[model samples]
Target: GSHMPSNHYGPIPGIPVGTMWRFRVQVSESGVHRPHVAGIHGRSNDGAYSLVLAGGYEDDVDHGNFFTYTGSGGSCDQKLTNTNRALALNCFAPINDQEGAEAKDWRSGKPVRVVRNVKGGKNSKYAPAEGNRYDGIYKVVKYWPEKGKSGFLVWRYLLRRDDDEPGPWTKEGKDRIKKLGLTMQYPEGYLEA
Candidate 1:
């Protein structure tokens, strides 16, 4: 079974950026991000450890600077519950469940790890067309709100990329990936038994 403590901040050691996995299960096993289905993973009290940008929301905007992300909800208005609050806690400002919150000199907010999947490839060239790919560390800058096209309020978050490691798109990172000879990390005994 995949084993890694939850609610950990910063990058998981030994798993370098640009690591690839054919499934989220391997990703979970590597402890890069540990939620099978959910996008955000962390505790409300501790802030978020990681998130998978599986899809580009209609309200999202990302170009390696910061992602304008929409909060999580299913067909209804998103709430500041569970992982949503975790994301908010990463902001370098006070919590605001009513109105939106802003960050102040936010170069040192809690680290929020980032992983991308094929589902978000259309809008994000960062996403791997094959499976889930670990990009690097990102931090939450601020949070706000907006009415989705569906006419329901959604919590919006701004996450900034801040890691020593380069993104997969860069030549440095691409070279490192090749230098590491990284292949899709497969499951234990995968396709053997």
Candidate 2:
């Protein structure tokens, strides 16, 4: 019956592509990234915000223009928690909070914030030097059920860049990043003695 406040939903204006944040908490604080531990942040009836890429799966391919994202459900039993269940709820159409639901229109589905953690390693060239980096707004092009690396069926979503900012892979994007001096930042007192 009740749902996330309207303000909690929708795209965050002014966050251009290649914007980087030092921590997932920082992204969450910025409202670009939601959920603390769960990988996806979206309402069952609305849409998702952003997801984190920490190299949880070896098969995940991050090519910048497009990427395959894993779902939150796990365990052989497919147990569901409030956090993971929320992800399943998003799969449903008309926001029935049920599983096995697919969006009618992917492009119209909703914008999702994309963040990559440094821990993902070199598997993804887009991984930031340190901490979580905000790549940009990606839309849920589509989703489906598939066997995950753990041998259990998991939901996966395909995301594609749909923003106005230049992609980080291009020369102009790289130059813009340099002009902004964006780099891996640390905690407030991380290096303090």
Candidate 3:
């Protein structure tokens, strides 16, 4: 009942303004990818989001950027520097979300087939799709394996703007989110809050 003491914070964290999120994550550990987990995340409601990825998980063995998810940081180091080329990401192999406690899948399990380099450079994760117009909603920035407070190396990425939605920080995105009747949600028992 949301009382489990782990990193499944139930609802996501706060997404500031002028940012876009792309997730490189898994669906589930079994049964057609149930209870998916995302590297980059946000709430359609409240106009906010956060990130959760492979290297970030507690399971040391499974925590590396091998999952074939897209999205990364950009050239500029601003909050959301999507104006440059987005960093597309392709891991070394497929992360089997159907294995252990750290395993998860996208509830949508929708294959991420879109990509764009917000900046101008040679990125390993860039693979073009035929007849697809990646106007903006999708982007990849950059990637790194930084050590978190846990003293574990976590694969990190940064994503930025391509959508007209006022961004989580702008008055525009906030207003649009309200118009869309958006609100924060809990995972299963997320709201003992």
Name the candidate that leads on lDDT.
1
Candidate 2 regions exceeding 4 Å error are 1-11, 77-105
The prediction achieving the highest TM-score against the true structure is 1
- The residue-by-residue lDDT of candidate 3 on 1-193, one tens digit each, is 6432222212222222222222111112211112244334332221112232222233322111122232333232222222111121111122221220121222211112122212211232221121111211322233344454455433443333334334333467557556655443223443443
- The superposed Cα distance between candidate 3 and the true structure at residue 152, in angstroms, equals 6.2
TM-score of structure candidate 1: 0.90
Clashes per prediction? 0, 1, 33
Give the runs in model 3 whose Cα sits over 4 Å from its true position: 1-138, 146-154, 184-193
Taking all chains together, each candidate's TM-score versus the true structure is 0.90, 0.75, 0.28
lDDT of 2 by residue, 1-193 (tens): 3533322544566555677776777777666676677677765443555677788767678888788776665566243343334444434344322344466565565566677888876678877777777776666555556667778876665667776667766898888789887766566886751
- Give candidates' CA RMSD values in order: 2.5, 4.6, 16.9
The lDDT of each candidate is 0.83, 0.64, 0.27
Worst 10 residues of 3 by lDDT: 83-92
lDDT of 3 at 113: 18
Instruction: Report the Cα lDDT for residue 118, model 2.
Output: 88
Residue-level lDDT tens digits of model 1 in 81-159: 8888989989888888888687776777888889888888777766687888888989888887778878988888888
Sorted by TM-score (best first), the order is 1, 2, 3
Winner by TM-score between candidate 3 and candidate 2 = 2
